[PDB]
Amino acid sequence: CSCSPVHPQQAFCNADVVIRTKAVSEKEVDSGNDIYGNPIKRIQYEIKQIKMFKGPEKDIEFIYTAPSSAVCGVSLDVGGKKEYLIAGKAEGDGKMHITLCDFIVPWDTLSTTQKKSLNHRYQMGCE
């Protein structure tokens, strides 16, 4: 989608599952073509789970995102990044939804506004 990632705060207020997990493995699961005839594809995120700031109690060792370098996500392979607090609307437990336009960072980047939001449970009426 080549969306534009921003909201250095509205990202942690929109998400619903912040976990500093680490995506090392994935799963190329087709998702059919889009409205452009192009293949969707929603590569998985067989992370290893290292942290779970906000979200469920178990964890989402299997997240969902877009393939390639990152069209609708951050495409994390760990071997290129490390770990991320991946925080998005989520999809429940054991699996959620995360996109580039959505709140997602390798953690080792944030800046502050994202950290101050890391303290909050889940959108503590921040802004």
Curated annotation (Swiss-Prot):
This is Metalloproteinase inhibitor 2. Induction: Down-regulated by TGFB1. Complexes with metalloproteinases (such as collagenases) and irreversibly inactivates them by binding to their catalytic zinc cofactor. Known to act on MMP-1, MMP-2, MMP-3, MMP-7, MMP-8, MMP-9, MMP-10, MMP-13, MMP-14, MMP-15, MMP-16 and MMP-19. One of its GO terms (biological process) is negative regulation of metallopeptidase activity. One of its GO terms (molecular function) is zinc ion binding. The chain holds residues 27 to 153 of 220 of the full protein. Zn(2+) binds at C1. Residues 1-126 form the NTR domain. The keyword Metal-binding applies. It is found in: Secreted. Interacts (via the C-terminal) with MMP2 (via the C-terminal PEX domain); the interaction inhibits the MMP2 activity. The keyword Transmembrane helix does not apply. It comes from Homo sapiens (Human). The activity of TIMP2 is dependent on the presence of disulfide bonds.
